[PDB]
Design a protein around this ligand. Structure first.
Ligand SMILES: Nc1nc2c(c(=O)[nH]1)N[C@H]1C(S)=C(S)[C@@H](COP(=O)(O)OP(=O)(O)OC[C@H]3O[C@@H](n4cnc5c(=O)[nH]c(N)nc54)[C@H](O)[C@@H]3O)O[C@H]1N2
Ligand SMILES: Nc1nc2c(c(=O)[nH]1)N[C@H]1C(S)=C(S)[C@@H](COP(=O)(O)OP(=O)(O)OC[C@H]3O[C@@H](n4cnc5c(=O)[nH]c(N)nc54)[C@H](O)[C@@H]3O)O[C@H]1N2
Ligand code: F3S
Ligand code: FES
Ligand code: FES
Ligand SMILES: [Mo+4]
Ligand code: NA
Lengths: 135, 822, 134
């Protein structure tokens, strides 16, 4: 091979200006079995993208035992119904409380000013239930 | 493991000077997102190297230690690769083992830098805790302010770097110096490696010869190189490798001949003055043959006698430059009288046979057949700088050099080999006396002591007396702090201040790491190193380079110059609040947002109109240097002083000092000095009289300094889990020790511990211990003795050795095989 | 998918043909990677064979890639380039030198049934290669 990196796809999510503050968008990345959310937080955070540096994206599969987590708009967290793990959308998937041993994986977005496009280009962290992010 | 991620073709590339030694080797830092990589084809990676098939020797220096993955303040991850620059003149793509580790010693959350200081740390009476920067400044500035108001500046102590490179440099020395000297105005300041505000080079400077007076190219042009008190393969690796060895190999002969059409150039030779047979001696013999190396294995401390005997002989033979002496020197005839020593007396004192003394003079000073004196570069370091009377040795050595016109000619120089890089720009020292700071602290002086960019628990002379006193004084403050409950910062300042009136000392460390200083410190502030900040510095031939920022510091770690500004602005604010406009005004001039601001304020203002007094290695043309101009210069930079600048030419600098015979003295002449031989100091002689072994000490090739990074490196710790002592095998047998046994080394000054390292080349009744280390501090057994300028004879102590026992683990994991290549 | 390199399994020799402190040369994992196996004569941690004393290394210096030479008197590999020396008795530990990596170890299987030594892997990265397997 040579290669030490996974071959991630480049997947269009949307243009940034279509996202409303605190209204999660669903997409799949890096394939149709990996559910993800992108959300405009409404306020800049470290590593947020877009015009207001505030768009973040995640794998929604709990890194404990893999249940799809749900985005809570009031707390801006992802909550797992399995064993009650909760992840902070504003702290790069930091576990607030729970049984996981890994932060919620971040979907890396490129933001292109010229087109206003958000493209999913990678994952930081390992998605639940996978030997590698790219199957 | 078994692979590397290549840098992509378009990876970001910045310039970086090596963090560590004087040589200042040039490197490139490749930075790129973690999930990208280069291809193996040479045009698909940033190195331009073909990784589709095996690379030949010399094609690259690249290991996993030269790679890392950093996590930035934005949470994003980036591959880094820190590798030597092939087109840098200094190193021509060479990397030492020390600089080769730079990538590994960059800050990452899980790597070797994991214990980097990331926030202020406070010892709150009985436990370490985090605190805020504002609380830290309120406590630290508060104390300084209280001390200024009640005791004056003499209550405020520092030991601070004056050096270049990482933990130094022009921005940082200016920042600290302006704080200590212009703002606080304290004279109670020592330097990282010596316990007063002084120079290593008083004699040579006062004789009119600054100690970095040549180019590295001069080591290529020399007939003869002297290495005096100097183990340069280990201590100045790539100067030795890239410049010295090519000369010894004959690779530079054709360049000598092109420069000097009418001059004989024999095969180059090398002379080492060192009591010890070092790896550098061995490697020189391997490269050049035994017949082109002279190891003058002098008795410890006998340098002055050596040089007075050589000076006497070259004068008697007439192997001197009488036209040079007459036109360009003063005091020769006096020095001939005061320094007179016969070769027989010289041989008796040094232990060096008369034949070897005569041969060294013959190689070095006797005219070649074409008429010209040999081009003899005289290179010296800590074997004489920390030797038997710093001032007198340099006086004796320089007398020889000046009489033989070995300054100012190409292929010559009487130079420091150097330690750290250089990067000094500071206000003048605000006192009129040298003060032995350690002694002052031991005697109970000062309210607050800051270790800044240094660790004298590991590196002071008489270090045991120091640690004892500091720990006890620290404990008094700890005891006083613990009776407080619910105190405001201001009340706490008063409690601590009171404790210092009863013998206590508040201790602060400004550092990358806790270190052993954490055993005594009450406050620790996080600093940032090159690559986390921009930084300027120069090497042993005065070559100034910019090291570019490419990554964030850990947490709230800051550039030392900016920590200084923070402290100054905190003090200014307190004074303004207290209605003391005059005292506030002393803390003006630290409106700095970036390190560059410190560069503009210091280096670039030296000697300019409306500037205050500034002592700078840049001199008065330092304003011609800018960060953007250094960037355009690359890792080659410019040799200081800068002579000209324009957009089309770049920075044009200075290759060699003193080539027209004008020295840095009142009259423009070099000045000879008397150099009396008085034996060893009585303090050292008393140790020698009582105890068995000479306790030589200094550097290991692989270990950098106090092992601040190296202590966290699993390979380093497996190789050198403990400080080692080179012992003669016959002495070993007498003490029933072998490799991997632990011994106590002790005298009247202290007690320390080392692992035994049998070394055939060590002389009976002599030893060699690694200095500065994290497990077994050598300096406990060094004396308090210093020369007239408070320069320690660190290489001058004796002690006894007692077996503790066999460390089985050391025997299973540590090599005790020979470090002298043959 | 795969996280590991695909190392070949290469026969070196049978253990009992090795004489104490007489290096055998072979290439692994391809003909541009020179290696040595030596019977040290005395057990060492991780030595293979009947006396747990056979070790093997890449001989390319991990500094800048010159072929090192085995010195029988010290049981080390010495580099003529910038004078690095590695300890064959301490898994390639650098005794003194300019490298930042120990000399890579060739991992040998020892099969009692056949007396075969087979090179099956490398511990460390060989000089001048992006991966041990090109
Ligand atoms: N017996 C004996 N004693 C000796 C000597 C000897 O030969 N024999 N030699 C002497 C010599 S030559 C010297 S140079 C001294 C060295 O004495 P020290 O200067 O005490 O030792 P170093 O390891 O250079 O100290 C550097 C310190 O600064 C920290 N540091 C690194 N980078 C930075 C940075 O960017 N900022 C800040 N704020 N801190 C930083 C490191 O973690 C470490 O604690 O030892 C001297 N002591
Ligand atoms: N690998 C490595 N390199 C370094 C450093 C490091 O820690 N690690 N530190 C850097 C610094 S800050 C410095 S100051 C330099 C130090 O560079 P050097 O001064 O080159 O190193 P040292 O090992 O202190 O001492 C040099 C020699 O002095 C000899 N010596 C002892 N006593 C005497 C004496 O009375 N007379 C004479 N003529 N020689 C004597 C010792 O045997 C020794 O080989 O190295 C720099 N480079
Ligand atoms: S790599 Fe660094 S340690 Fe000195 S020899 Fe070169 S500056
Ligand atoms: S499966 Fe999510 S908290 Fe266990
Ligand atoms: S290439 Fe082997 S020591 Fe440099
Ligand atoms: Mo030093
Ligand atoms: Na002690």
């Amino acid at each position: 091979a040579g290669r030490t990196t996974l071959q991630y796809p480049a997947t269009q999510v949307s243009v940034a200006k279509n996202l409303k503050a605190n209204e999660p968008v669903s997409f799949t990345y890096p394939d149709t079995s990996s559910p993800c959310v992108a959300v405009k937080l409404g306020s800049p955070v470290p590593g947020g993208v877009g015009p207001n540096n505030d768009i973040v994206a995640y794998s929604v599969l709990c890194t404990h035992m893999g249940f799809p987590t749900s985005y809570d708009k009031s707390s801006k967290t992802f909550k797992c119904p399995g064993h009650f793990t909760e992840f902070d959308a504003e702290k790069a998937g930091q576990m607030i409380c729970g049984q996981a041993t890994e932060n919620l994986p971040r979907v890396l977005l490129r933001y292109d000013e010229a087109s206003d496009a958000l493209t999913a280009v990678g994952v930081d962290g390992l998605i639940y239930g996978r030997q590698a992010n790219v199957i | 493991n078994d692979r590397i991620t290549l840098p992509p073709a378009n990876a970001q590339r910045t310039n970086m000077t090596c963090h560590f030694c004087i040589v200042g080797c040039g490197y490139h830092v490749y930075k790129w997102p973690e999930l990208q990589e280069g291809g193996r084809a040479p045009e698909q990676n940033a190195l331009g190297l073909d990784f589709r098939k095996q690379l030949p020797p010399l094609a690259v220096t690249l290991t996993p230690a030269m790679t890392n993955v950093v996590t930035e303040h934005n949470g994003r991850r980036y591959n880094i690769m820190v590798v030597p620059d092939k087109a840098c003149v200094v190193n021509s793509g060479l990397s030492s083992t020390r600089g080769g580790k730079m990538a590994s010693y960059m800050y990452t959350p899980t790597g070797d830098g994991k214990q980097r200081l990331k926030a202020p740390r406070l010892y709150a009476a009985d436990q370490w805790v985090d605190t805020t920067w504002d609380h830290a400044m309120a406590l630290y500035a508060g104390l300084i302010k209280k001390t200024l108001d009640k005791d004056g500046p003499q209550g405020v102590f520092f030991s601070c770097f004056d050096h270049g490179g990482a933990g130094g440099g022009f921005e940082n020395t200016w920042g600290t110096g302006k704080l200590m000297f212009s703002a606080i105005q304290t004279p109670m300041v020592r330097i990282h490696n010596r316990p007063a505000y002084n120079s290593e080079c008083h004699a040579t400077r006062e004789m009119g010869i600054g100690e970095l007076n040549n180019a590295y190219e001069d080591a290529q042009l020399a007939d003869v190189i002297w290495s005096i008190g100097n183990n340069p393969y280990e201590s100045q690796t790539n100067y030795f490798l890239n410049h010295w060895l090519p000369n010894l190999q004959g690779a530079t002969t054709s360049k000598k001949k092109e420069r000097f059409p009418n001059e004989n150039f024999p095969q180059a030779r090398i002379i080492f003055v060192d009591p010890r047979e070092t790896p550098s001696v061995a490697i020189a013999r391997h490269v050049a043959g035994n017949d082109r190396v002279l190891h003058l294995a002098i008795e410890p401390g006998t340098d002055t006698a050596l040089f007075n005997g050589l000076f006497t002989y070259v004068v008697e033979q007439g192997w001197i430059d009488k036209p040079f002496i007459e036109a360009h020197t003063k005091g020769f005839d006096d020095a001939v009288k005061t320094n007179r020593l016969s070769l027989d007396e010289c041989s008796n004192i040094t232990g060096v046979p008369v034949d070897m003394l005569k041969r060294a003079a013959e190689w070095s000073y006797k005219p070649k057949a074409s008429g010209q004196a040999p081009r003899t570069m005289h290179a010296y370091e800590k074997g004489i700088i920390w030797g038997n009377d710093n001032y007198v040795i340099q006086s004796a050595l320089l007398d020889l050099v000046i009489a033989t016109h070995n300054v100012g000619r190409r292929g010559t120089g009487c130079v420091r080999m150097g330690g750290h890089q250089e990067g000094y720009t500071r206000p003048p020292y605000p006192g009129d006396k040298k003060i032995y700071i350690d002694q002052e602290l031991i005697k109970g002086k000062g309210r607050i002591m800051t270790w800044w960019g240094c660790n004298n628990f590991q590196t002071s002379n008489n270090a045991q007396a120091l640690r004892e006193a500091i720990l006890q004084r620290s404990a008094i403050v700890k005891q006083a702090m613990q009776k407080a409950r619910g105190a405001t910062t201001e009340e706490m300042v008063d409690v601590i201040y009171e404790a210092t009136q009863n013998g206590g000392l508040f201790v602060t460390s400004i550092n990358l790491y806790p270190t052993k200083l954490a055993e005594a410190a009450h406050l620790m502030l996080p600093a940032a190193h090159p690559g986390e900040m921009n930084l300027t510095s120069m090497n042993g031939e005065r070559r100034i380079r910019l090291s570019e920022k490419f990554m964030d510091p850990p947490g709230t770690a800051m550039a030392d110059c900016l920590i200084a500004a923070r402290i100054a602005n905190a003090l200014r604010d307190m004074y303004q609040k207290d209605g003391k406009a005059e005292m506030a005004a002393q803390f003006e001039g630290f409106d700095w947002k970036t390190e560059e601001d410190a560069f503009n304020d210091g280096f670039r203002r030296a000697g300019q109109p409306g500037a205050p007094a500034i002592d700078s290695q840049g001199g008065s043309t330092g304003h011609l240097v800018t960060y953007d101009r250094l960037r355009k210069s690359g890792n080659n930079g410019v040799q200081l002083p800068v002579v000209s600048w324009d957009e089309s030419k770049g920075l044009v600098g200075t290759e060699m000092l003193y080539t027209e015979g004008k020295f840095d003295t009142d009259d423009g002449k070099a000045h000879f000095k008397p150099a009396p031989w008085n034996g060893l100091p009585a303090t050292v002689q008393q140790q020698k009289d009582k105890y068995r072994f000479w306790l030589n000490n200094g550097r290991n090739n692989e270990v950098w300094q106090t092992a601040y990074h190296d202590q966290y490196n699993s390979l380093m710790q497996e190789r050198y889990p403990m400080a080692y002592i080179e012992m003669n095998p016959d002495d070993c047998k007498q003490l029933d020790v072998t490799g991997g046994d632990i011994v106590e080394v002790y005298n009247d000054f202290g007690s320390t511990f080392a692992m035994v390292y049998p070394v055939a080349e060590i002389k009976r009744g002599q030893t060699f211990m690694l200095f500065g280390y994290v497990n077994g501090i050598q300096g406990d057994v060094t004396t308090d003795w210093t020369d007239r300028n408070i320069i320690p004879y660190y290489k001058g102590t004796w002690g006894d050795i007692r077996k503790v026992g066999s460390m089985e683990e050391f025997k299973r994991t540590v090599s005790f095989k020979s470090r002298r290549f043959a």
